[PDB]
Amino acid sequence: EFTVSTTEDLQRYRTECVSSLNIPADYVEKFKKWEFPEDDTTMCYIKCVFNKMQLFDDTEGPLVDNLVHQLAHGRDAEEVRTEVLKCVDKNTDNNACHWAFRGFKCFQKNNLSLIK
Numbered sequence: 001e002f003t004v005s006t007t008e009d010l011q012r013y014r015t016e017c018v019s020s021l022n023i024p025a026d027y028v029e030k031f032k033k034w035e036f037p038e039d040d041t042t043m044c045y046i047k048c049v050f051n052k053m054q055l056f057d058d059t060e061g062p063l064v065d066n067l068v069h070q071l072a073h074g075r076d077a078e079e080v081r082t083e084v085l086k087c088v089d090k091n092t093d094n095n096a097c098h099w100a101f102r103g104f105k106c107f108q109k110n111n112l113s114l115i116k
């Protein structure tokens with residue numbers, strides 16, 4: 001049973017991902033200011049966060065219904081689903097880090113935030 005992540009849930013997941021991926025201090029300061037370089041360090045960090053939020057599976061990819069519940073923030077569920085589906089694609093370059101990051105960049109482009 002999926003449940004929406006709070007701001008506190010997300011802060012914890014980011015902390016856990018920084019620790020478990022041994023993310024260097026300079027990347028943590030970039031992420032804090034919503035700067036996400038297009039390197040494997042950043043891409044695997046985003047995958048880790050999305051994994052913990054149950055928004056992404058390394059084999060199945062983006063978890064569409066879970067994403068709609070998380071990202072809607074009081075918007076129309078059908079409108080948000082249409083937006084999410086436009087950002088959902090196949091694992092064409094066989095890389096779950098690249099895959100999760102691509103979706104994230106698409107969500108950002110379309111002003112879909114994890115927290116309002």
Ligand SMILES: [Cl-]
Pocket residue numbers: 049
């Ligand atoms: Cl994030």
